Design an enzyme around this catalytic site. Structure first.
Site, mmCIF file in Angstrom:
data_model
loop_
_atom_site.group_PDB
_atom_site.id
_atom_site.type_symbol
_atom_site.label_atom_id
_atom_site.label_comp_id
_atom_site.label_asym_id
_atom_site.label_seq_id
_atom_site.Cartn_x
_atom_site.Cartn_y
_atom_site.Cartn_z
ATOM 1 C CG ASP A 182 36.465 74.929 1.237
ATOM 2 O OD1 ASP A 182 37.555 74.322 1.225
ATOM 3 O OD2 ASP A 182 36.319 76.025 1.854
ATOM 4 C CB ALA A 212 33.634 87.739 -7.220
ATOM 5 C CB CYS A 221 32.918 87.065 -0.586
ATOM 6 S SG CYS A 221 31.883 87.701 -1.904
#
Length: 259
Positions: free
Chosen positions: A166, A199, A197
């Protein structure tokens, strides 16, 4: 290396970005600052032609090779119809997803496929998930897409990478490299692979870079990552977003070489 990347342009000077900024298209962008160039954006047939997706083609003439991609963002609730229309129009057989739906409590992608044995309907396409198989780092699903106007069916392989941390980048590149080699194993002819993904620039750029480096390595050809990145950015701005991503790419490239 990690200094010239930071100097390199994010967007190609001169390349117009107009359609992506049209008032009617704004809420079709996940991120207001990540937009397709007019010249390489994917067009939809219909009265509204817009999706935040770009054609990105990587030419390696020294290997008589062109690797085609469509790079796009994670679909939004109201852009799933358009996403599946692209998949249908281009008869794409492989979708590569590089995120989980949420990361650190932030939404990255809308779930645009059903959990088996459920079905979904998006833009007149019926989607069914025929199979779902997990490995440590990724999930492989077989999707049956049906055009409800014509009855025509198309099978699409959906690969979702779930192990990217993350924050930052993988500590050990092994699993990601195996994943990229699996993607390479499923690539067809001159058929684009759809990659996204959140963006469609960061992890997507890392993937495109690594597949390109693997093709070059395989034929014993020289690899200049800064060239590979510039080539992508001429087709979709900002690809490979962070130094951490670029640094990850570089070390990984040296691993595949040395290993």
């Amino acid at each position: 290396v990690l200094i010239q990347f930071e100097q390199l342009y994010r967007k190609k000077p001169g390349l117009a970005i107009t359609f992506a900024k049209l008032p009617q298209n704004l809420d079709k962008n996940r991120y207001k600052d990540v937009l397709p160039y007019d010249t390489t954006r994917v067009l939809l047939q219909g009265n509204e032609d817009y999706i935040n997706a770009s054609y990105v083609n990587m030419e390696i003439p020294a290997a008589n090779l062109v690797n085609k991609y469509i790079a796009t963002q994670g679909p939004l609730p109201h852009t799933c119809a358009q996403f599946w229309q692209v998949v249908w129009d281009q008869k794409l057989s492989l979708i590569v997803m590089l995120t989980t739906l949420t990361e650190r409590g932030r939404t990255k992608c809308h779930q645009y496929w059903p959990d088996p044995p459920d079905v979904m309907n998006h833009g007149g396409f019926h989607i069914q998930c025929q199979s779902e198989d997990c490995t440590i780092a990724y999930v492989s699903r077989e999707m049956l897409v049906t055009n409800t106007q014509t009855g025509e069916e198309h099978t699409v392989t959906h690969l979702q990478y779930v192990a990217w941390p993350d924050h930052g980048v993988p500590d050990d590149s092994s699993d990601f490299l195996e994943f990229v080699n699996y993607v390479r194993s499923l690539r067809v002819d001159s058929e684009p692979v759809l990659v996204h993904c959140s963006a469609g620039i960061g992890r997507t750029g890392v993937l495109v870079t690594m597949e390109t480096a693997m093709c070059l390595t395989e034929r014993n050809l020289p690899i200049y990552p800064l060239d590979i990145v510039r080539k992508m950015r001429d087709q979709r701005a900002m690809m490979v977003q962070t130094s951490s991503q670029y640094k990850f790419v570089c070390e990984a490239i040296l691993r595949v070489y040395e290993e």
